[PDB]
Design an enzyme around this catalytic site. Structure first.
Site, PDB file in Angstrom:
ATOM      1  N   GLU A  11       0.776  -1.217   0.000  1.00  0.00           N
ATOM      2  CA  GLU A  11       0.000   0.000   0.000  1.00  0.00           C
ATOM      3  C   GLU A  11       0.818   1.282   0.000  1.00  0.00           C
ATOM      4  O   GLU A  11       0.254   2.363  -0.149  1.00  0.00           O
ATOM      5  CB  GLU A  11      -0.811   0.034   1.328  1.00  0.00           C
ATOM      6  CG  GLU A  11      -1.879  -1.022   1.429  1.00  0.00           C
ATOM      7  CD  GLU A  11      -2.981  -0.797   0.434  1.00  0.00           C
ATOM      8  OE1 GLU A  11      -3.126   0.237  -0.205  1.00  0.00           O
ATOM      9  OE2 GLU A  11      -3.798  -1.807   0.375  1.00  0.00           O
ATOM     10  N   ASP A  20      -6.678   6.726  -4.296  1.00  0.00           N
ATOM     11  CA  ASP A  20      -6.226   5.398  -4.476  1.00  0.00           C
ATOM     12  C   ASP A  20      -6.377   5.008  -5.973  1.00  0.00           C
ATOM     13  O   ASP A  20      -6.752   5.820  -6.790  1.00  0.00           O
ATOM     14  CB  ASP A  20      -6.905   4.462  -3.497  1.00  0.00           C
ATOM     15  CG  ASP A  20      -8.363   4.214  -3.800  1.00  0.00           C
ATOM     16  OD1 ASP A  20      -8.942   4.677  -4.741  1.00  0.00           O
ATOM     17  OD2 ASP A  20      -8.940   3.362  -2.991  1.00  0.00           O
ATOM     18  N   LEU A  32      -8.557   4.118   3.671  1.00  0.00           N
ATOM     19  CA  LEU A  32      -9.642   4.725   2.919  1.00  0.00           C
ATOM     20  C   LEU A  32     -10.428   5.719   3.704  1.00  0.00           C
ATOM     21  O   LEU A  32     -10.939   5.422   4.793  1.00  0.00           O
ATOM     22  CB  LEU A  32     -10.642   3.699   2.381  1.00  0.00           C
ATOM     23  CG  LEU A  32     -11.833   4.377   1.672  1.00  0.00           C
ATOM     24  CD1 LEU A  32     -11.427   4.906   0.290  1.00  0.00           C
ATOM     25  CD2 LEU A  32     -12.938   3.362   1.495  1.00  0.00           C
ATOM     26  N   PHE A 104      -8.160  -6.477   3.674  1.00  0.00           N
ATOM     27  CA  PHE A 104      -7.751  -5.115   3.914  1.00  0.00           C
ATOM     28  C   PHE A 104      -7.967  -4.302   2.654  1.00  0.00           C
ATOM     29  O   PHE A 104      -8.445  -3.197   2.677  1.00  0.00           O
ATOM     30  CB  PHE A 104      -6.275  -5.097   4.416  1.00  0.00           C
ATOM     31  CG  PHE A 104      -5.699  -3.740   4.702  1.00  0.00           C
ATOM     32  CD1 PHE A 104      -5.397  -2.866   3.660  1.00  0.00           C
ATOM     33  CD2 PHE A 104      -5.353  -3.375   6.010  1.00  0.00           C
ATOM     34  CE1 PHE A 104      -4.791  -1.631   3.910  1.00  0.00           C
ATOM     35  CE2 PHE A 104      -4.791  -2.122   6.272  1.00  0.00           C
ATOM     36  CZ  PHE A 104      -4.505  -1.247   5.220  1.00  0.00           C
ATOM     37  N   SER A 117     -13.195 -19.567  -5.096  1.00  0.00           N
ATOM     38  CA  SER A 117     -11.766 -19.550  -4.728  1.00  0.00           C
ATOM     39  C   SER A 117     -11.568 -19.982  -3.287  1.00  0.00           C
ATOM     40  O   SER A 117     -10.617 -20.646  -2.947  1.00  0.00           O
ATOM     41  CB  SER A 117     -11.226 -18.146  -4.884  1.00  0.00           C
ATOM     42  OG  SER A 117     -11.177 -17.848  -6.246  1.00  0.00           O
ATOM     43  N   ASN A 132      -8.276 -19.662 -10.406  1.00  0.00           N
ATOM     44  CA  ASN A 132      -9.574 -19.069 -10.158  1.00  0.00           C
ATOM     45  C   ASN A 132      -9.461 -17.643  -9.633  1.00  0.00           C
ATOM     46  O   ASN A 132     -10.217 -16.724  -9.968  1.00  0.00           O
ATOM     47  CB  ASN A 132     -10.297 -19.894  -9.061  1.00  0.00           C
ATOM     48  CG  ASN A 132     -11.775 -19.532  -8.977  1.00  0.00           C
ATOM     49  OD1 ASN A 132     -12.283 -18.807  -8.114  1.00  0.00           O
ATOM     50  ND2 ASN A 132     -12.481 -19.950 -10.016  1.00  0.00           N
TER      51      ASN A 132
END
Ligand code: CL
Ligand code: CL
Length: 162
Positions: A11, A20, A32, A104, A117, A132
């Site tokens: 990040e 972002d 965020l 996250f 998945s 997948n």
């Protein structure tokens, strides 16, 4: 390597409000602020999160504090989720880190929607799961990041981050 270092890599770290990859207002270590288009809305959310009048700028300590809260919240989001908890419980240390990373990034809800998945990871079918997971908007939008998380699930090692 650990979850903190991992997500710090994925990040980055910015002390001033930024947009972002999706164009939403963020700060610190992927924290965020708002999906709203107003910088004021973001500045308001920021002062409320920090507890002071920031003027859109925070310190390193403050970023790290949001980061810690955010990691914590993700884990706890996982443990509370009926679809997530069991997968998480079935994985080894490394792979769990990879699951946290996705939560996250996209939220418990986003991740919980990778039904297929999830089942693959629970069955320990690494190569299949990896194929997948790749067929998703997630991977097409942030391919390098997705690749690292995906290799982590596939190998159970930190190689993608070394
Ligand atoms: Cl908060
Ligand atoms: Cl990327």
């Amino acid at each position: 390597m650990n979850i903190f270092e991992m997500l710090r890599i994925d990040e980055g770290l910015r002390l001033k409000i930024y947009k972002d990859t999706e164009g939403y207002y963020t700060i610190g270590i992927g924290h965020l602020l708002t999906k709203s288009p107003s910088l004021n809305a973001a500045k308001s959310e920021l002062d409320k999160a920090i507890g002071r009048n920031t003027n859109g700028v925070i310190t390193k300590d403050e970023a790290e504090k949001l980061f810690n809260q955010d990691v914590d919240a993700a884990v706890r989001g996982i443990l509370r989720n009926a679809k997530l908890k069991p997968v998480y419980d079935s994985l080894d240390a490394v792979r769990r880190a990879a699951l946290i990373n996705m939560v996250f990034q996209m939220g418990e809800t986003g991740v919980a929607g990778f039904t297929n998945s999830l089942r693959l990871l629970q069955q320990k079918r690494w190569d299949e799961a990896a194929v997948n997971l790749a067929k998703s908007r997630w991977y097409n939008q942030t391919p390098n990041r997705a690749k690292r998380v995906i290799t982590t699930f596939r190998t159970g090692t930190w190689d993608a981050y070394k």
